[PDB]
Amino acid sequence: HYLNSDGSRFVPKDFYPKFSWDTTPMYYMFGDTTRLLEPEEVEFIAERTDFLCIEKSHGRTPLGAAELGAKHEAAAFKKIKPDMKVLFYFNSAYAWPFTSYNQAFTRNKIDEHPKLKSFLIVDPKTAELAHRRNVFFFDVLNPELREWWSTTVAKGVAESGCDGAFIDQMHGFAWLRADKSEDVQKAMGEMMALLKRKMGPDKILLGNNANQDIAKDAFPVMDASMFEHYNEKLLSKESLLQDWDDMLRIAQAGKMSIFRIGVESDQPVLAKERAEYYLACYLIGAQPYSYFQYGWGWTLSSGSLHEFPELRKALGPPKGAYDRTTPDGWEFTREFEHASVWVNTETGNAKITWR
Template sequence: MKKFLLNFSALWIALFFCVPSMAQNSYVISDGSVFENKTFYPKFSWDTTPMYYMFGDPKRVLLPDEVEHIVKRTDFICIEKSHGEGELGAAELGTKHEVEAFKKIKPEIKVLFYFNSAYAWPFTSYSKGFLKKNIDQHPELKKFLIIDSETKELAKRRNTYFFDVLNPDFRVWWVNTVVKGVEFSGADGAFIDQMHGFSWLRADKSLDVQKAMGEMMAALKVKLGPDKIVLGNNAQTKAARFVFPSIDANMFEHYGNTLLSKEKLLQDWDDMLRISKAGKMSIFRIGVEYDTAVSENPTYYKGKTRNERFAELSKEKLQYYHACYLIGAQPYSYFQYGWGWQLSHGSLMDYPEFQKSLGAPKGAYTRISDEGWEFTREFEHASVWVNTEMEEAKISWHEN
C-alpha cells in the first residue's frame, strides 16, 4: 500500500505540472503554485513556444500576407510607436488599421497601443506639437518638458524632448492621451516604454521621480479600466517598484549586452517567477543586435544588407537565446526575438523551432552545481540544457 501511495503521488505531481489545472485557464508555476488567468489576458498555451510580437514600419501599414504571417504565430502583439505614420499621417491611425486587420482574422488576439512615458515622440496626432519646429507654437505642451540644468534649454536627444513626470499637469495630460489612443485605435491596452523619468538628470529628486511615475501608471490603469492590459518595459527593477503594482505585464527588454550576462539572466529567471506569482505576464525580449558578436564586429550595422547579416546571426544564436527563455519561462511568459523594433527586424522571419511541439514544463529548472552556470529543464516534448557562461545550449525535441 505504501508503494502504491508513493507511485500515485508521483503520478499526480507529474500530471499537475504537465497540464492545466482543473480550473479553467489555470497553469502551474514552477514552485507548484497556480497562476490564475485574468479574463482580459491573451490566450496562453504551452503547445508551442508562446510568442509576443512588437513591430512597426514608419512608412506604411502591413500587407495582407504579413498580417497572416504574424497572426499564425502569436496571440499577443504591440504596434510600435511610429507605425503607418508615413502612409496614414499619425501612429494612432496605424494602430487602428492593424487592430482591425488582426481582429478580422483572429478576434481574440490582444493588440497594444504604444506610448512612451519619458521621450516626447511626435508620431501621433496628440504629440506632433513636440516636434522641434512646432514646440514654440505650443506653450501648453512645452511646459511638460524637462529643462537642461546646464544649458537652460529643453533637454533632448537627437531632437526628441524629455517629458517631466514631476509636473502634475503633465501626468494628467499623459494619462488622458494614452487612454485616448487606446480607445480610438480599439486596442486592448498599452505598452508603456521608458519608465525611468530621466531620474539621473535630477539625482536629488530621484525618489520623487520614481514615485511620480508610479502615481501616473496607477492613474492610467484606473482610467483605462479593469479589462485593459498595461505592459511596462523593464518594470521589474528596483527603480520601478512604484510602477510594478499597476502593470499587468512586464518586458525584459535586454537593451544591452551587459543585460545578457550569466548573472543577469539568473536574476531574470528569479524575476519571472516573482512576476508570475504576482499574477502578471512576462515578455522575455531578446534582440541579437546586442549580442557580443555584434559588439566585437560593428560592421553588422553597416550597409544595405545589414538586415541579412542580422537575420543570419539570429538563426545562429536562436538555440541559445531560445533556451535562455525556456529555462525561466512561467505561465504567461512570452518570448520575443529579432534584432530591433521595425517590421523588417525579424517579425517576418520564419523560425521553425517556435512551431515545434513544446508541452508544459515538468517542473522548475535545475542548476547542475551551486557554483556552475549549467542549467537544465524538462518539458513535455523537449529537454533544455544551457551554459550561460559559455553561451552554449542544446534543445532536444522529443518525438511525439
Template sequence: MKFNLSNISVLSIVLLFCSCVTAKIPYKISDGSTFETKSFYPKFSWETTPMYYMFGDPKRVLHPEEVAFIAERTDFICIEKSHGQGNLGAAELGAKHEVEAFKKAKPDMKVLFYFNSAYAWPFTSYNKNFTQENINNYPELKAFLIENPETKALEERKNVFYFDVLNPDFRKWWVNTVAEAVQFSGADGAFIDQMHGFAWLRQDKAQDVQKAMGTMMKALKEKLGPDKIVLGNNANARLARHVFPSIDANMFEHYGEKMLSKEKLLNDWQDMLKISKAGKMSIFRIGVEYDPVAHTNPTYYKGKLRNERYAKLSKEKLEYYLACYLIGAQPYSYFQYGWGWQLAHGSLMEYPQLQKPLGAPKSAYQRTSATDWEFTREFEHASVWVNTETRQAKIT
C-alpha cells in the same frame, strides 16, 4: 454508426463541457503554486513556444499576408510607435488599422498601443508639436518637458524631448492621451516604454520621480479600466518599483550586452517567477543586435546588408536564446525575438524551431551546482540544457 439530432445534441453538450473544463485547467508555476489568470489576458498555451510580437513600419501598414503570418504565430502583439505614419499621417491611425486587420483575422488577438512615458516621440497627432520647429508655439506643451537647470534649454536626445513626470499637469495630460489613443485605436491596452522618468538627471529628486511615475501608472490603469492590459517595459527594474503594482505584464527588454550576462539572466529567471506569482505576464525579449558577436564586428552589421546579416545571426543564435527563455519560462511568459523593433527586423522571419511541440514544463529548472552556470529543464516534449557562461545550449 447512425446519428440522429438527439445524438448530435448530446454529443455537442459533452464536447462543450469538456472544452470548458479544459479551459479552466489551472497553469502551474514552477514552485508548484497556481497562476491566477485574468479574463482579459491573451490566450496562452504551452503547445509551442508562446510568442509575443512587437513591430512597426514607419512608411506603411501591413499587407494581408503579413497579418496572416503573424496571426498564425501569436495571440499577443504590440504596434510600434511610428507604424503607418508615412501613408496614414499619424501613428494612432496605423495602430487602428492593424487592430482592425488582426481582429478580423483572429478575433481573440490582443493588440497593444505603444506610448512612451519619457521620450516625447512626435509620431502621433497627440505629440506632433513636440518638435524643435513647433514647441515654442505651444507653451502649455513646453511646460511638460524637462529643462537643463543651468542653460534652461530643453533636454533632448537626437531632437527628441524628455517628458517631466514631476509636473502634475503633464501626468494628467499623458494619462488622458494614452487612454484616448487606446480607445480610438480599439487596442486591448498599452505598452508603456521608458518608465524611468529620467531619475538620473535629477538625483536630488530621484525618489520623487519614481513615486510620480508610480502615481501616473496607477492613474492610467484606472483610466483604462479593469479589462485593459498595461505592459511596462523593464518595470521589474529598481527605478520602476513604484509602477509594478499597476502593470499587468513586464518586458525584459535586454537592451544591451550587459543585460545578457550570466548574472543578469539568472536574475531574470528569479524575477519571472516573482512576476508569475503576482499573477502578471512576462515578455522575454531578445534582440541579437546586442549579442557579443555583433559587437565584435559592428561595421559588418551596418549598411544595405544589415537585415540579411542579422537574419543569419538570429538563426545561428536562436537555440541559445530560446533555451535562456525556456529555463525561466512561467505561465503567461512570452518569447520575443529579432534584432530591432521594425517590421523588417525579424517579425516576418520563419523560425521552424519556434513551431516545434513544447508542452508544459515538468518542473522548475535545475542548476548543476551552486557555482556552475549550467542549467537544465524538462518539458513534455523537450529537454533543455544551457551554459550561460560559455553561451552554449541544446534543445532536444
C-alpha cells in the same frame, strides 16, 4: 490550471491574452514608418502569436499619424484572430512626435503650445528644453504632465481599438535630477495608476523593463513587464539568472512577462543560428503567461516575418522548475513535456533536444 515553477497555480485575469505551452509562447512587436502590413504579413504574424504590440511610428507616412497605424493593424489582426491582444505603444519619457497627440513636440511648434511645453524637462545648463535629437523629455514630476500623459495614452488606446498599452521607459530621467530619484520612482507609479484607471476595465498595461527596481512603484498596477535585453550586460550569466528570478516573482504576482531578445545585442542568419540559445535562455525561466519575443530589432523587417523553426516546435508544459546542475555553476536544465533544455550561460551554448 497553469502552474508556476514553484508549483503554485497561475490564475489569469479575464482580459489577459491566451496562453498555451503547445509551442513557445510568443509575443511580437513591430512597426514600419513607411507602410502598413500586407494582408499576407498579418496572416503570417497572426498564425504565430496571440499577443503583439504595434510600434511607435507605424504607418506614420501612409496615414499621417502613428496611432492610425496602430488602429489599422489592430483591426486587421482582429478580423483574422478576434481574441488577439494588440497593444498601443506610448513612450513615458521621450515625446516622439509620431502620433497626433505628440504632434506639437517639435522644435518649430512647441513654443506655440505653452501648456505642453511646461510638461517638459528643461536642461539646467541651457535654460532650454532638454532633448535627444530635438525630441523632448516628459517630466514625470510635473503633476499636470502625469494627468495629461495618462489621459493621452488612454485616448490613444481607445482611438486605436487596442487592448491596452505598452509603456516604454520607466526611468523618468532620474539621472537628470538624481536628488529627486525616489520622487521620480513614486511619480512613475502615480502616472501608471492614473493610466490604468483611465483606460477602463479590461485593458492590459505592459511596462518596458518593469522588473527593474526603478519601476517598483510602477510595477503593482502593471499587468505585464518586458525584459528588453537591450545590451550585453543584460545578457550576462548574472542578468539571465536575475531574469529567471524576476520571471518567477512576476508570475507569483499573477502578472505577465515578456522575455525579449534582440540579437543585435549579441543578421537573419545570426538570429536563426542563435535561436536555439536564446530560446533556451527563456525556457529555463518560463512561467505561465510569459512570452518570448525574438528578432534583431523593432521594425517589421526585424524578425517578425521570419521563420525560426524552434519557436514552432512542440514544447508542452514544464515538468518542473529548472535545475542548476551545480550550485555555483552556470549550467541550467529544464524538462518540458516535449523538449529537454540545456544551457550554459557562462559560455553561451545551449541544446534543446526536441522529443
